């Protein structure tokens, strides 16, 4: 009967002190966590953060909410969550988190006859993971989401992953634009602060960047302009207008590429592999123009000897530099 | 016992007037501040501010909340903060702040048997600090956070850093890609005005901008283009097309770099060291083109003497200008 369930619920809620956690004087309450990732909507290197969306479930035994005579698992409206005790769970590295409120506050309370309580939310977090761009765009990040209890110590509360490694789901279905989730790992620790030893859980994704964006219009055009400088070695030793225009226009193209790619890159004032590669190419075309300068000055003070030496050397030196760069950053 | 703790807490709450501070007629209540810095999210020069995230703890002794018979330190829900008096603290230099509400409004209350009250928050503030940028990107900034009391003077309240220099922690956790915190300083002030003495606390970071990115892209291309003008000296005095194309294309490249740096650097309509250096390089390439024009006019209306003079002078003048700039901005 509906009235029977109504009086049972009122009996459970009446005299319920939300402030006191379950087993206040007793041992710590064990809260089993669970996550179902819906998507990773964004991964920005500008702010070193990524947006995650997830169904976040928390299971805990609360003997005060045990009821008998109703074999069904009661599913109450979200507002009942205001009148009960829930863990003070929070994420350390979040920058701006919120619970979705589309037509209702997206929460679920599911009681059980044995006092077990399921509290689920739909949370969109903007987590912060620091990224090293030393090997960018050949990098591999380790972005993590960490979960802790803000107030209660390990003596008061206890966290664990519900179902072991199977707790977190939906990672496989994720399809990032410029990343690939190589692996996800779950960890449980106790973190000692000045106040006391708190519990912690951690969910870490190892994201490997996909190199399809960075070989076809970043390295390829710089390489080909370097080839055109090599062509500048091949023209002549007296056609001053042609060689000078070719060299300086190649320099101009490299400067244009560098400026527009820096405008394209996500504004991280730090040295990166692409930056050293492009500066190497720029220095190479600059050295080609200097080589023509030396040839012209020496003749108009052997020009053919220096031109042939440059023809032999510059391709070899650039190939050596490219091999060194590729092996160093791989 | 559940009932014993419940009735103890109920006894504490009743008879408690939140409007009245502890020892309302008595001496001022001493409040111990404490901060644990999680991270500095960003430091924006366009708005001259920085976003900080921290755990902000305040300790104060309240005899109305003292309890006996429970040797444990009671940790209650964040909602209990509604029913207790707390200091009217605020950050004087701020633009936007909030307390994280990820599944709970992030607060912790931890009553102690001797009446001591711990009030912890997790605050993501956006503090405003002045930023001189005459020496940009070689600038060295001093940003501050100014904690203060709104209504109370020293007679009613009093602030102090807890542990002295140990009050603020987590400075090592700060990872700014383009800055390095040289030091942090804590200053407690008791600023005496005619009406009364108002307390204040100041947490001041001394940031220094690393030059491993700005130097490379900002100065190496410009220096190399100036060296290409230097190449333009050595070509000839009758190869008109080659020298003219080289000089004017170097001018075009310098303009391109300047405009794209304007579009790249974060929009400070202000005179800076980088602007002075870029205009110096632009003026140098401009003078190279001008003296070639003089050479052409003299030759077609000695030319070699002017070319030798330029070869001797321009590298020396540019080295002198560079040395003066570096010594003046260091």
């Amino acid at each position: 009967n509906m009235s029977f369930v109504k009086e049972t619920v009122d009996k459970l809620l009446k005299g319920y002190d939300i402030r006191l956690r379950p087993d206040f004087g007793g041992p710590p309450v064990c809260v089993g966590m669970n996550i179902d990732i819906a998507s990773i909507d964004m991964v920005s290197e500008v702010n070193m953060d990524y947006t995650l969306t997830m169904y976040f479930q928390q299971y805990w035994r609360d003997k005060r909410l045990a009821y008998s005579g109703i074999p069904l698992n009661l599913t109450l409206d979200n507002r009942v969550a205001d009148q009960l005790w829930v863990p003070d769970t929070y994420f350390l590295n979040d920058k701006k988190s919120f619970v979705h409120g589309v037509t209702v506050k997206n929460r679920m309370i599911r009681l059980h006859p044995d006092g077990t309580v399921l509290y689920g939310l739909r949370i969109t977090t903007t987590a912060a993971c620091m990224m090293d761009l030393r090997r960018y765009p050949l990098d591999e990040q380790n972005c993590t989401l960490e979960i802790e209890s803000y107030g209660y110590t390990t003596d008061d509360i206890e966290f664990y992953w519900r179902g072991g490694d199977k707790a977190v789901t939906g990672v496989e279905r994720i399809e990032l634009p410029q990343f690939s989730i190589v692996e996800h790992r779950l960890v449980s620790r106790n973190v000692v602060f000045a106040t006391g030893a708190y519990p912690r859980l951690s969910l870490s994704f190892r994201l490997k960047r996909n190199i399809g964006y960075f070989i076809l219009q970043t390295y390829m055009p710089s390489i080909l302009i370097t080839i055109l400088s090599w062509v500048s070695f091949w023209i002549n030793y007296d056609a001053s207008a042609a060689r000078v225009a070719l060299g300086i226009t190649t320099v101009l193209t490299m400067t244009t590429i560098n400026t527009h790619l820096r405008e394209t890159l996500p504004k991280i004032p730090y040295v990166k592999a692409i930056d050293m590669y492009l500066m190497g190419c720029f220095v190479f075309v600059f050295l080609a123009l200097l080589e023509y300068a030396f040839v012209n000055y020496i003749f108009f003070s052997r020009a053919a000897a220096i031109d042939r030496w440059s023809r032999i050397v510059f391709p070899f030196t650039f190939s050596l530099f490219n091999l060194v760069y590729w092996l160093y950053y791989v | 016992n559940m009932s014993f703790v419940k009735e103890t807490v109920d006894k504490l709450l009743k008879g408690y007037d939140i409007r009245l501070r502890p020892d309302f007629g008595g001496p001022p209540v001493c409040v111990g501040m404490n901060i644990d810095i999680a991270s500095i999210d960003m430091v924006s020069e366009v708005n001259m501010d920085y976003t900080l995230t921290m755990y902000f703890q305040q300790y104060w002794r309240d005899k109305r909340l003292a309890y006996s018979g429970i040797p444990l330190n009671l940790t209650l829900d964040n909602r209990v903060a509604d029913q207790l008096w707390v200091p009217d603290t605020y950050f004087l230099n701020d633009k936007k702040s909030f307390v994280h509400g990820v599944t709970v409004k992030n607060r912790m209350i931890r009553l102690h048997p001797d009446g001591t009250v711990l009030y912890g928050l997790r605050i993501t503030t956006t503090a405003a600090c002045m930023m001189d940028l005459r020496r940009y990107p070689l600038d060295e900034q001093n940003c501050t956070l100014e904690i203060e009391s709104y209504g109370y003077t020293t007679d009613d309240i009093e602030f102090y850093w807890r542990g002295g220099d140990k009050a603020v922690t987590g400075v090592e956790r700060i990872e700014l890609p383009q800055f390095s915190i040289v030091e942090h300083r804590l200053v407690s002030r008791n600023v005496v005005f005619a009406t009364g003495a108002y307390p204040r606390l100041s947490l001041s970071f001394r940031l220094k901008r690393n030059i491993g990115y700005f130097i490379l892209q900002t100065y190496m291309p410009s220096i190399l283009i100036t060296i290409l003008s230097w190449v333009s000296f050595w070509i000839n005095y009758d190869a008109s097309a080659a020298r003219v194309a080289l000089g004017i294309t170097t001018v075009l490249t310098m303009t391109t770099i300047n405009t794209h740096l304007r579009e790249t650097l974060p929009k400070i309509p202000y005179v800076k060291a980088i602007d002075m250096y870029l205009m110096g390089c632009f003026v140098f390439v401009f003078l190279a083109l001008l003296e070639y024009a003089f050479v052409n006019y003299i030759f077609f209306s000695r030319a070699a003497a002017i070319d030798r003079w330029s070869r001797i002078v321009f590298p020396f003048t540019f080295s002198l200008f560079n040395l003066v700039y570096w010594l003046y901005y260091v």
């Epitope: 380790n142 993590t144 106790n190 000692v192 951690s202 | 922690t169 400075v171 090592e172 956790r173 990872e175």
Partner: nanobody, 105 residues
Framework: LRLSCAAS????????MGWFRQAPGKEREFVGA????????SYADSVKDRFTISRDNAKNTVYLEMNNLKPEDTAVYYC??????????????????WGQGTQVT
């Protein structure tokens, strides 16, 4: 005296570096802290202005140097690494990867 500690592997995941002293009686007691990036340092009160830390990323090595030794300092030292969200610095349990004890008189 001089005592350096070189690291390897995924150093970026463990930016913070700690120097612990394990006495015969009491456990790993104080912390000489240093960040890999920026060289920001933090010392215990007892070891201020006498033990100092530097770093060099050309070989990824920190350098703790002892100055003005007293006889009570005879003990074994550990070099440990700590992550970006491991909590407080002055607690050995927050540190993950421990090194071999170096005994010094």
């Amino acid at each position: 005296l001089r005592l350096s500690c070189a690291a390897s592997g995924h150093t970026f995941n463990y930016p913070i570096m700690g120097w612990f002293r394990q006495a015969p009686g009491k456990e790993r007691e104080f912390v000489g802290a240093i960040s890999w990036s920026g060289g920001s340092t933090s010392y215990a009160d007892s070891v201020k202005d006498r033990f100092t830390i530097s770093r060099d990323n050309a070989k990824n090595t920190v350098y703790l140097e002892m100055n003005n030794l007293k006889p009570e300092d005879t003990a074994v030292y550990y070099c440990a690494a700590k992550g970006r969200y491991s909590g407080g610095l002055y607690y050995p349990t927050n540190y993950d990867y421990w090194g071999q004890g170096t005994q010094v008189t």
